[PDB]
Protein backbone atom coordinates (compact mmCIF):
# COMPACT_ATOMS: atom_id res chain seq x y z
CA UNK A 1 0.00 0.00 0.00
CA UNK A 2 1.91 2.86 -1.31
CA UNK A 3 -0.67 5.52 0.95
CA UNK A 4 0.78 4.40 4.20
CA UNK A 5 -1.99 4.66 6.69
CA UNK A 6 -1.79 6.98 9.54
CA UNK A 7 -1.56 5.89 13.41
CA UNK A 8 -1.21 1.75 13.59
CA UNK A 9 2.59 0.88 13.17
CA UNK A 10 1.57 -1.27 10.65
CA UNK A 11 -1.35 -2.45 9.18
CA UNK A 12 -3.31 -3.93 5.84
CA UNK A 13 -5.78 -6.20 4.19
CA UNK A 14 -4.48 -9.96 5.55
CA UNK A 15 -5.07 -13.55 5.44
CA UNK A 16 -5.57 -15.90 7.95
CA UNK A 17 -5.23 -20.05 8.42
CA UNK A 18 -4.65 -22.57 10.33
CA UNK A 19 -1.87 -25.70 9.32
CA UNK A 20 -2.69 -24.45 6.00
CA UNK A 21 -6.22 -25.48 5.90
CA UNK A 22 -8.82 -23.17 5.33
CA UNK A 23 -7.83 -19.30 4.65
CA UNK A 24 -10.08 -16.40 5.64
CA UNK A 25 -10.05 -12.72 5.02
CA UNK A 26 -9.58 -10.48 8.06
CA UNK A 27 -7.40 -7.27 8.97
CA UNK A 28 -4.00 -7.17 10.70
CA UNK A 29 -2.76 -4.00 12.41
CA UNK A 30 -0.30 -3.03 15.13
CA UNK A 31 -1.34 -1.15 17.95
CA UNK A 32 1.20 1.66 18.33
CA UNK A 33 0.70 1.96 22.37
CA UNK A 34 2.26 -1.67 22.33
CA UNK A 35 4.45 -2.21 19.26
CA UNK A 36 4.68 -5.92 21.20
CA UNK A 37 1.56 -7.02 19.79
CA UNK A 38 -0.39 -8.05 16.64
CA UNK A 39 -4.06 -7.50 16.65
CA UNK A 40 -6.61 -8.58 14.14
CA UNK A 41 -10.16 -7.92 12.95
CA UNK A 42 -12.17 -10.53 11.28
CA UNK A 43 -16.52 -9.75 10.21
CA UNK A 44 -18.54 -12.76 11.01
CA UNK A 45 -16.12 -15.48 9.60
CA UNK A 46 -15.04 -17.27 12.90
CA UNK A 47 -14.43 -16.27 16.55
CA UNK A 48 -11.80 -18.81 17.49
CA UNK A 49 -9.23 -16.48 15.57
CA UNK A 50 -6.19 -15.12 18.16
CA UNK A 51 -7.20 -11.35 18.89
CA UNK A 52 -3.92 -10.23 20.47
CA UNK A 53 -0.68 -12.19 19.42
CA UNK A 54 2.29 -11.87 21.88
CA UNK A 55 4.94 -11.16 18.95
CA UNK A 56 7.88 -11.29 21.64
CA UNK A 57 6.56 -14.92 22.38
CA UNK A 58 6.14 -15.76 18.86
CA UNK A 59 8.28 -17.58 16.86
CA UNK A 60 8.21 -16.33 13.07
CA UNK A 61 8.96 -19.56 10.38
CA UNK A 62 8.63 -19.11 6.77
CA UNK A 63 6.89 -22.63 5.19
CA UNK A 64 8.08 -24.25 2.00
CA UNK A 65 6.96 -23.26 -1.45
CA UNK A 66 6.36 -26.70 -1.99
CA UNK A 67 3.34 -27.03 0.21
CA UNK A 68 -0.08 -26.71 -1.31
CA UNK A 69 -1.19 -23.31 0.43
CA UNK A 70 -3.33 -20.64 -1.41
CA UNK A 71 -1.30 -17.74 -1.61
CA UNK A 72 2.42 -17.86 -2.28
CA UNK A 73 3.38 -15.09 0.22
CA UNK A 74 2.77 -16.35 3.39
CA UNK A 75 4.95 -17.27 6.89
CA UNK A 76 4.01 -19.45 9.50
CA UNK A 77 3.69 -18.49 13.61
CA UNK A 78 3.83 -20.92 16.35
CA UNK A 79 3.45 -19.86 19.54
CA UNK A 80 1.44 -20.33 23.16
CA UNK A 81 1.01 -24.12 21.84
CA UNK A 82 -0.77 -22.76 18.84
CA UNK A 83 -0.29 -22.46 14.57
CA UNK A 84 -1.44 -19.95 12.54
CA UNK A 85 -0.57 -18.65 9.20
CA UNK A 86 -0.13 -14.73 7.57
CA UNK A 87 0.06 -14.75 3.52
CA UNK A 88 0.75 -10.64 2.23
CA UNK A 89 -0.19 -9.70 -1.27
CA UNK A 90 3.25 -10.14 -2.32
CA UNK A 91 7.05 -9.89 -1.34
CA UNK A 92 7.35 -6.95 -0.71
CA UNK A 93 4.40 -6.64 1.28
CA UNK A 94 5.45 -9.91 2.73
CA UNK A 95 8.63 -7.73 3.91
CA UNK A 96 7.33 -5.11 6.01
CA UNK A 97 5.32 -7.72 8.09
CA UNK A 98 8.08 -10.38 8.83
CA UNK A 99 10.53 -7.14 9.56
CA UNK A 100 8.02 -5.13 11.66
CA UNK A 101 7.14 -8.91 13.38
CA UNK A 102 10.84 -9.36 14.05
CA UNK A 103 11.91 -6.49 15.02
CA UNK A 104 9.50 -6.44 17.29
CA UNK A 105 9.70 -9.74 19.37
CA UNK A 106 13.77 -9.17 19.48
CA UNK A 107 13.40 -5.42 21.62
CA UNK A 108 16.96 -4.00 20.04
CA UNK A 109 17.49 0.07 20.62
CA UNK A 110 15.71 2.57 23.00
CA UNK A 111 12.48 2.87 20.49
CA UNK A 112 8.62 1.61 20.62
Known amino acids: GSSGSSGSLLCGPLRLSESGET ?3 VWA ?3 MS ?6 LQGGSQDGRLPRTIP ?3 C ?3 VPDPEERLDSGHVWKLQWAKQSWYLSASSAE ?3 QWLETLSTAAHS ?3 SG
Open 34 to 39: DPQVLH
Open 55 to 57: LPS
Open 23 to 25: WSE
Open 108 to 110: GPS
Open 93 to 95: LQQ
Open 29 to 31: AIP
Open 59 to 61: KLS
